[PDB]
Design an enzyme around this catalytic site. Structure first.
Site, mmCIF file in Angstrom:
data_model
loop_
_atom_site.group_PDB
_atom_site.id
_atom_site.type_symbol
_atom_site.label_atom_id
_atom_site.label_comp_id
_atom_site.label_asym_id
_atom_site.label_seq_id
_atom_site.Cartn_x
_atom_site.Cartn_y
_atom_site.Cartn_z
ATOM 1 N N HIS D 17 -7.612 0.338 -2.515
ATOM 2 C CA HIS D 17 -7.381 1.678 -2.809
ATOM 3 C C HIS D 17 -8.593 2.518 -2.637
ATOM 4 O O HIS D 17 -8.968 3.453 -2.128
ATOM 5 C CB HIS D 17 -6.942 1.691 -4.487
ATOM 6 C CG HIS D 17 -5.647 1.292 -4.761
ATOM 7 N ND1 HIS D 17 -5.267 0.458 -5.938
ATOM 8 C CD2 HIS D 17 -4.490 1.449 -4.006
ATOM 9 C CE1 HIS D 17 -4.139 0.038 -5.947
ATOM 10 N NE2 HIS D 17 -3.529 0.696 -4.794
ATOM 11 N N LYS D 41 7.899 1.909 -17.825
ATOM 12 C CA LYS D 41 7.180 0.779 -17.378
ATOM 13 C C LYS D 41 5.738 0.800 -17.659
ATOM 14 O O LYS D 41 5.030 1.277 -17.059
ATOM 15 C CB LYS D 41 7.247 0.566 -16.011
ATOM 16 N N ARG D 90 -0.171 -0.152 4.569
ATOM 17 C CA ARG D 90 -0.506 -1.406 5.191
ATOM 18 C C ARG D 90 0.220 -1.994 6.239
ATOM 19 O O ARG D 90 -0.131 -2.544 7.309
ATOM 20 C CB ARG D 90 -0.556 -2.566 4.141
ATOM 21 C CG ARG D 90 -1.551 -2.362 2.900
ATOM 22 C CD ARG D 90 -1.273 -2.713 1.689
ATOM 23 N NE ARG D 90 0.079 -2.280 1.246
ATOM 24 C CZ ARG D 90 0.613 -2.277 -0.006
ATOM 25 N NH1 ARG D 90 -0.369 -2.891 -0.909
ATOM 26 N NH2 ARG D 90 1.662 -2.056 -0.437
ATOM 27 N N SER D 127 -1.937 -4.373 -6.276
ATOM 28 C CA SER D 127 -2.406 -4.396 -7.594
ATOM 29 C C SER D 127 -1.370 -5.620 -7.985
ATOM 30 O O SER D 127 -1.734 -6.480 -8.917
ATOM 31 C CB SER D 127 -1.975 -3.223 -8.426
ATOM 32 O OG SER D 127 -2.919 -2.064 -7.852
HETATM 33 N N1 LIG Z 1 -4.733 -2.633 0.389
HETATM 34 C C1 LIG Z 1 -4.410 -1.282 0.727
HETATM 35 N N2 LIG Z 1 -4.652 -0.425 1.744
HETATM 36 C C2 LIG Z 1 -4.453 0.635 1.639
HETATM 37 N N3 LIG Z 1 -3.510 1.297 0.825
HETATM 38 C C3 LIG Z 1 -3.091 0.600 -0.112
HETATM 39 C C4 LIG Z 1 -3.406 -0.937 -0.311
HETATM 40 N N4 LIG Z 1 -2.752 -1.264 -1.456
HETATM 41 C C5 LIG Z 1 -1.929 -0.254 -1.848
HETATM 42 N N5 LIG Z 1 -2.179 0.851 -1.036
HETATM 43 C C6 LIG Z 1 -1.513 2.194 -1.341
HETATM 44 O O1 LIG Z 1 -1.883 2.752 -2.415
HETATM 45 C C7 LIG Z 1 -0.692 3.249 -3.016
HETATM 46 C C8 LIG Z 1 -0.595 3.193 -4.937
HETATM 47 O O2 LIG Z 1 -0.939 1.835 -4.844
HETATM 48 P P1 LIG Z 1 -0.332 1.282 -6.147
HETATM 49 O O3 LIG Z 1 -0.514 0.056 -6.550
HETATM 50 O O4 LIG Z 1 -0.848 2.543 -7.284
HETATM 51 O O5 LIG Z 1 1.227 1.734 -6.568
HETATM 52 P P2 LIG Z 1 2.459 1.013 -5.684
HETATM 53 O O6 LIG Z 1 1.979 0.431 -4.512
HETATM 54 O O7 LIG Z 1 3.737 2.008 -5.959
HETATM 55 O O8 LIG Z 1 2.579 -0.208 -6.815
HETATM 56 P P3 LIG Z 1 3.544 -0.553 -7.970
HETATM 57 O O9 LIG Z 1 5.229 -0.114 -7.292
HETATM 58 O O10 LIG Z 1 3.381 -1.929 -8.478
HETATM 59 O O11 LIG Z 1 3.389 0.626 -8.880
HETATM 60 C C9 LIG Z 1 0.668 2.556 -2.452
HETATM 61 O O12 LIG Z 1 1.604 3.526 -2.332
HETATM 62 C C10 LIG Z 1 -0.028 2.253 -1.125
HETATM 63 O O13 LIG Z 1 0.479 3.235 -0.156
HETATM 64 MG MG LIG Z 2 1.591 -1.445 -3.739
#
Ligand SMILES: Nc1ncnc2c1ncn2[C@@H]1O[C@H](COP(=O)(O)OP(=O)(O)OP(=O)(O)O)[C@@H](O)[C@H]1O
Ligand SMILES: [Mg+2]
Ligand SMILES: Nc1ncnc2c1ncn2[C@@H]1O[C@H](COP(=O)(O)OP(=O)(O)OP(=O)(O)O)[C@@H](O)[C@H]1O
Ligand SMILES: Nc1ncnc2c1ncn2[C@@H]1O[C@H](COP(=O)(O)OP(=O)(O)OP(=O)(O)O)[C@@H](O)[C@H]1O
Ligand SMILES: Nc1ncnc2c1ncn2[C@@H]1O[C@H](COP(=O)(O)OP(=O)(O)OP(=O)(O)O)[C@@H](O)[C@H]1O
Ligand SMILES: Nc1ncnc2c1ncn2[C@@H]1O[C@H](COP(=O)(O)OP(=O)(O)OP(=O)(O)O)[C@@H](O)[C@H]1O
Ligand SMILES: Nc1ncnc2c1ncn2[C@@H]1O[C@H](COP(=O)(O)OP(=O)(O)OP(=O)(O)O)[C@@H](O)[C@H]1O
Ligand SMILES: [Mg+2]
Ligand SMILES: [Mg+2]
Ligand SMILES: [Mg+2]
Ligand SMILES: [Mg+2]
Ligand SMILES: [Mg+2]
Lengths: 157, 157, 157, 157, 157, 157
Positions: D17, D41, D90, D127
């Site tokens: 992030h 959630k 990713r 995460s």
């Molecule tokens: N290693 C990474 N490199 C680049 N972008 C990433 C990486 N990990 C996550 N992201 C991007 O960051 C955004 C936000 O991640 P975040 O963990 O807040 O939400 P999420 O992926 O929807 O997770 P969850 O479904 O657990 O809430 C995701 O939509 C993804 O596009």
């Molecule tokens: Mg994610």
């Protein structure tokens, strides 16, 4: 002294899984099938039943054993002196998902992961889809070991 | 007595390839790197040069050797008493392409194929892209073995 | 004499679906839209509501009819003396999923599946996303037929 | 004056992030990191805890601000006089999912979306997976900002 | 009277192709297999040889005919009073390529395209790979119709 | 002060490209369209023709200019004191390819790449396919700007 762990929930083991087991057992001196216990899903078969079904189906594989597992897979692998995981893949989507896990597992514990391509004949079989189809009366007898199939019929009736 | 063949054109071998070699050499008693000669593409380095570059880069791997190869890969593998191929994969597209080859190779000769995920740090390196970037002056020294890099600079100047 | 079944939950039907219906109806003598119901999962619209919304937006397709069902789709198909399923696909991910379903359905019942590519204009449209967007007040009026849009807004209020 | 919103649950923020945040802040006059609250959630960290962890990790980005958000994302964006979303990707399936969301967001509100490719080193971190690994004793310290890691240890006790 | 065109180079026809032909002939009133001639790429078999190999393999399909074709495919289709193309798909990348072609063909001429999923057993076969394997002495007899295989042996001598 | 480079061969520019230009120009202070030329591959249109066709169809974008170049794109970017590339993506396959390029470009020069999803209406459009279709007489008038279509027909005749 080479060795690899084949993990899954195996609920139940399919001919697709068995094909992977056979191929791993042909290339590594020691194979351990890890039946992963998840308490956030009982599934259809108990861990004990899943283990038994795999053992029955793998009797012709002298260098394979079956054990239940909990917690971090890499801990399971390393506590048994190994550092390789073997998993089958059906699709590019499977690969992308397993790529992330494989890289994480290598990062945290140095454990490597080897993938094999599904046998063409079993490209469409998964434990979940087999159970779903069988639940509604479809014939999945050609997709599961003989033992498993009878046990599945039992769970439904 | 386990063993696997790692095929490619390796023109030149990259740190991505070397990572795969190291991982194969850690899990199989015997690894053979097969430098595949294609007469419908000379490439940048001769087969002899490619072999030499790989040998230099793999000196810390006692159970690995390097040989040139022609014709059917499965014949190469079986004529050396082995029946496993190890290849790295970067993407789901790589997987779909290699899936077809793996299934064909299993069908015609019983040779299995094991895939490993790329190291994250080398996800974007390929021999072709490294050569292209270097040709136009980009610094690829962090992407290639030290020996290879100097040899590449030579081929360009 | 030719015919196909177009299955879905259609909760609610979208313009992407209607495009698929129109194309199926243009190519086969009869088309049945199969509204597949989960007796354990209510969804947003009742079965009668789903059917009514589809009928109202397919009035210009004389060889199309709408029926509900549950359980194995292949049973619904074969009970009507048909042997073909027609489904739209948007992405490679859709294709990987639907290929496994199609191969399973052919395996268990000999029923074939024909896929059609989404219309470019509706490639991002799904019932689920349309409901989600509308739930938070986003304007989905151009993505749904007239028979659907205000009924959807009604459910949400 | 150019600007974009970077949305997520960020529970907790990772180095993946952060890499996206830094690259966005380098190219847009202003960046707002939107910490999205979902009432059904509750994650591991409260929204306020998440905001503080991001603020600490982005202390050197003066044109980047952090706020909580709820509801339709394109409303959040437009209410702040902006018209762009920035997100990291990713894998190919990340792209397929985000492409449909981006096309939907552009259709319903005229808001555009810019994607960046993950840093190679963090391509496998999420995460959710970091939390899972940490819960079972895996070392994810190289994948998270220094401060986050300390707080994460705290929540596991 | 429903109908579709099944296009390809078919050099030579494989059991994968034949499976598609059989399924198309089961669902459409008429099928035309279009053997596409490319002047700049003379394949292994002449167009007439390819047509005869398909005719021999499809002898039991009375509503399927075989013709040579050249130029814009949607012209070939419309000139025969038809408005549909049928093609087999093996992988997600097959789908991505064919989806764009199908959308283009629908845009420029109103001709639709129906896809079928490969039979699991033949998911890895292609004319090009079969030829390559056969050229180097691999046994592809289980992948091609009986007659084709005999002719293929002939061209390799 | 913010800016981005939109690279391509643009042989010729399509409506899919123009959509990307418009979206880039709306979000950054300046946009440079980089017509990248292969001095060893002529293509259909000359550099002056390509530039003229783009200028004519971007007259309503005051902060956009068009320049040609060759060699490493990152050099073109940095020589103009910029650090961002903007590219449209249609498919997951596009993404896998462009992710590797983006990561290489960041590695060798610190230049960032931002991607944008294709407009749904033009998702199937590419210069190459448009040229191919037009070569065989297919109607691509709705896929290309007015500055392009008849010039293309002229080249072909
Ligand atoms: N290693 C990474 N490199 C680049 N972008 C990433 C990486 N990990 C996550 N992201 C991007 O960051 C955004 C936000 O991640 P975040 O963990 O807040 O939400 P999420 O992926 O929807 O997770 P969850 O479904 O657990 O809430 C995701 O939509 C993804 O596009
Ligand atoms: Mg994610
Ligand atoms: N036909 C097949 N050939 C090769 N590998 C397969 C096949 N079917 C499944 N696999 C792989 O074997 C592994 C074990 O599968 P298993 O059903 O035990 O767990 P799973 O796929 O995670 O399913 P669930 O989510 O229901 O636990 C999985 O990684 C799966 O992708
Ligand atoms: N960074 C990497 N990590 C893991 N595997 C890789 C990496 N780069 C390439 N590979 C794989 O290693 C194998 C050997 O690659 P090599 O460059 O020798 O041949 P290739 O990929 O067929 O290229 P070419 O088509 O130019 O011969 C290929 O299957 C390739 O996909
Ligand atoms: N925009 C579209 N264009 C073409 N086909 C589509 C489109 N959206 C969905 N489809 C197809 O329509 C089928 C039925 O969709 P429907 O929403 O009824 O079910 P679903 O996709 O299984 O959703 P859910 O999981 O919400 O029940 C889907 O399987 C998909 O094949
Ligand atoms: N095993 C298979 N199962 C289903 N469909 C297949 C299979 N193999 C090929 N096809 C489909 O048949 C079509 C025609 O195949 P054919 O070999 O004639 O042409 P091609 O794939 O374009 O090959 P080439 O590029 O060598 O001419 C392909 O577009 C592909 O969609
Ligand atoms: N329909 C579209 N929508 C959005 N972006 C597109 C579209 N078509 C192409 N692009 C993007 O535009 C970029 C430039 O396209 P261009 O045709 O100039 O080069 P190319 O795709 O490398 O083709 P070629 O190999 O024929 O030179 C492509 O890399 C792709 O990222
Ligand atoms: Mg599974
Ligand atoms: Mg490569
Ligand atoms: Mg859907
Ligand atoms: Mg082919
Ligand atoms: Mg293109």
């Amino acid at each position: 002294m080479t060795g690899a762990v084949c993990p899954g929930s195996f609920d139940p083991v399919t001919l697709g899984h068995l094909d992977v087991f056979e191929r791993a057992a042909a290339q590594f001196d020691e194979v351990i099938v890890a039946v992963l216990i998840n308490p956030n899903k009982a599934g259809m078969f108990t861990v004990d039943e899943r283990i038994e079904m795999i053992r029955e189906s793998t009797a012709d594989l002298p260098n394979l054993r079956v054990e239940s597992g909990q917690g971090l897979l890499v801990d399971f692998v390393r506590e048994r002196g190994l550092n390789a995981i073997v998993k089958g893949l059906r699709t590019g989507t499977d690969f992308e998902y397993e790529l992330q896990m494989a890289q994480m597992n290598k990062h945290i514990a140095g454990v490597d992961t080897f993938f094999v391509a599904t046998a063409p004949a079993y490209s469409f079989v998964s434990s979940s889809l087999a159970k779903e189809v069988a639940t509604y009366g479809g014939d999945v007898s050609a997709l599961l070991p003989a033992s498993v199939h009878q046990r599945l019929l039992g769970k439904l009736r």
